[PDB]
């Protein structure tokens, strides 16, 4: 006569949360965007189809110079590519071959990665002794790693498959703070443009707005209906759109605190795996499992464009920090550049 | 622009060094047969003749990966194992209803849309424990069609083993075979075995050789 009391009280809490979400929801975005003009048929073709990988590319992150890009494979390679002259800059052989994430630092001096080895390995690129080598390894998780991101040159934030995100300091080498509260595998992170608070999409059909300062789940978004695979904050920081296995994208916002937009057609039946925005925030790029990448209008929910291309599914997508290119990394061992 | 061209030439030299290193890694990758082990440890007699295991049989190098240090929501890391060659699915065949959930995990591995090209080596340990389990009277409480599943005509049992033991043994073998034939186009085949101690890696090597040969015959459209 104790446990049921607070869980029906939690049900009542969820009831007034839903009442507060409904009462502040006078007009959806899709009915007040009909006054603005669509962006028409957007053609983008392959500028450089960079070919270096022996196996499927599972992750990718552009550099803040919008020139270099890390690509990690289940080959066991992490090869750092120069996107203009379509050639290699580094090739790091990893410790465990199954890696699922990679992150090029905003300074450029480090590259983190991690996979089923439960360890975030941070490689240095600016060693005075020449060759690249593992500057730090981070081992405090009990599940795998799905997405790691650099807040700055000094501290990483990791998403794991044991319901935890984590802020790690690299110099100390242990978890500065944890982030618990999910119930499923936490599949993707997204840092805000001011890097004070990150959004985490997981396998409980929810996305939690955390914050790295004091370390708590300040917001929680339950609008999806399947496992959320990828997430990316809107370029201002007030919204984020995220995609899940139910073959849709959903745009949420961090202040109105509900779902704003749903992106799904009748041909869209494959659960998606990557989202990103343009620099303006108008094009929600989303890479899927029907081997294509839809280019959604992030304000009017139309298929503005369709990236054709890859022979197997995509698994990572990244837009440059000046908005110049859309790199899609896939399972046919290539990653192509779109523009 | 002189130092531009010299920097581009140095970058192209780095490109050629990395490209020849990656073709050497292609020649060591495309001949490395790797296999997922996903059964309740026990591989200590498979390695000796924490996650991975690089061993070798007859100039063919295998890369076993054990997944004991993950959670049991398997639906997100098991999608990493696409280019893997075989899945050693180990069934502790007697001890609850472990067998039906093992069948459900095998059905889920079988019908997953990113694992519908790779094949499952199927080991079944504890067959002596299943022998004293069928001689005690408990699979008949779990499986009703076992009451009328007659012993097959293509049986290759142990000479001297009790007929109820081989009855339950080939019953659950054909139940895994019913799952692995009820949904498939011939892209991948379950390879059942029964063990436990002996050279299990000989069965692993023969079955992975059969997987590679059937894949090469499917891509010539001979099979």
């Amino acid at each position, epitope marked *: 006569s104790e446990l049921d009391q607070l869980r029906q009280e939690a049900e009542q809490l*969820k009831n007034q949360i*839903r009442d507060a979400r409904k009462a502040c929801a006078d007009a959806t975005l899709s009915q007040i965007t009909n006054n603005i003009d669509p962006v028409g048929r957007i053609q983008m073709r392959t500028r450089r189809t960079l070919r270096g990988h022996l196996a499927k590319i599972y992750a990718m992150h552009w550099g803040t110079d919008s020139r270099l890009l890390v690509s990690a494979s289940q080959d066991g390679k992490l090869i750092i590519w120069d996107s203009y002259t379509t050639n290699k800059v580094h090739a790091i052989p990893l410790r465990s071959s199954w890696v699922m994430t990679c992150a090029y630092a905003p300074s450029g001096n480090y590259v983190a990665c991690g996979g089923l080895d439960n360890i975030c390995s941070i490689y240095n690129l600016k060693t005075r002794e020449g060759n690249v080598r593992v500057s730090r390894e981070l081992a405090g998780h009990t599940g795998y790693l799905s997405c790691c991101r650099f807040l700055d040159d000094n501290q990483i934030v990791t998403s794991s498959g044991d*319901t935890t995100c984590a802020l790690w300091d690299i110099e100390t080498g242990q978890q500065t703070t944890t982030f618990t509260g999910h*119930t*499923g595998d936490v599949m993707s992170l997204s840092l805000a443009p001011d890097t004070r608070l990150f959004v985490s999409g997981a*396998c*409980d*059909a929810s996305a939690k707005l955390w914050d790295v300062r004091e370390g708590m789940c300040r917001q929680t978004f*339950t*609008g999806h*209906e*399947s*496992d959320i695979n990828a997430i990316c904050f809107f370029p201002n920081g007030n919204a984020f759109a995220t995609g899940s*296995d*139910d*073959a849709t994208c959903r745009l949420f916002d961090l202040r109105a605190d509900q779902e704003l937009m749903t992106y799904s057609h009748d041909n869209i*039946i494959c*659960g998606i795996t990557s989202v990103s925005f343009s620099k303006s925030g108008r094009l929600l790029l989303a890479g899927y499992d029907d081997f294509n990448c839809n280019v959604w209008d992030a304000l009017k929910a139309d298929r503005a464009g369709v990236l054709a291309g890859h022979d197997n599914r995509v698994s990572c997508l990244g837009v440059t920090d000046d908005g110049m290119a859309v790199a899609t990394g896939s399972w046919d061992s290539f990653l192509k550049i779109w523009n | 622009t002189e130092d531009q061209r010299n920097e581009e030439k140095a970058q192209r030299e780095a490109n050629k060094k990395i490209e020849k290193q990656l073709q050497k890694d292609k020649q060591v990758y495309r001949a490395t047969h790797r296999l997922l082990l996903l059964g309740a440890s026990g591989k200590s007699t498979i390695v000796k003749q924490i996650f991975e295991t690089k061993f070798q049989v007859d100039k063919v190098n295998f890369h076993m990966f054990d997944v004991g240090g993950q*959670r*049991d*929501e*398997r*639906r997100k890391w098991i999608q990493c194992f696409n280019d893997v060659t075989a899945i050693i699915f180990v069934v502790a065949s007697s001890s*609850t*209803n472990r067998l*039906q*959930e093992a069948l*459900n*995990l095998f*059905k*889920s*591995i*079988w*019908n*997953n*849309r990113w694992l519908r090209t790779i094949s499952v080596i199927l080991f079944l340990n504890k067959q002596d424990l299943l022998a004293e389990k069928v001689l005690a009277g408990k699979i008949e*409480d*779990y*499986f*009703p*069609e076992f009451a009328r599943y007659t012993t097959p005509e293509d049986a290759t049992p142990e000479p001297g083993e009790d007929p109820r033991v081989t009855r339950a043994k080939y019953f659950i073998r054909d139940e895994f075979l019913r799952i692995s034939t009820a*949904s498939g186009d011939g892209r991948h085949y379950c390879y059942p075995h029964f063990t436990c101690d002996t050279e299990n890696i000989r069965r692993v090597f023969n079955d992975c050789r059969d997987i590679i040969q059937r894949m090469h015959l499917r891509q010539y459209e001979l099979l």
Partner: nanobody
Amino acid sequence: QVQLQESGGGLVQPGGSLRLSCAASGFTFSNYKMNWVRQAPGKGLEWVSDISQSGASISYTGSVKGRFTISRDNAKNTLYLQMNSLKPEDTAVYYCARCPAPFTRDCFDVTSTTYAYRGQGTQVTVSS
């Protein structure tokens, strides 16, 4: 929000009949194959039944073959499980876990009590 409210069950003499149901709201019910899982006291979660997206391809666990029957209605967004000829082995906490993807034929929801898309649970105790 994916929520799964189940109702039914209680104290029934073994040999009678019983009925569980669960309403499923938060998604398109017409696209997920559905399951029924149970937790026996002193054991883990064990699978009982599956049904496909439409309702044709049904499957049961071996211990309930002929005894139990599940049936889904997307027009009501709910699922019913009829327990005919109840047994003393059926004293368990009952769960209607769904499967996490549209238009698929695989499920990974017999976990060690950590799954998000699963109901709260109905205790069905079988005594004298």
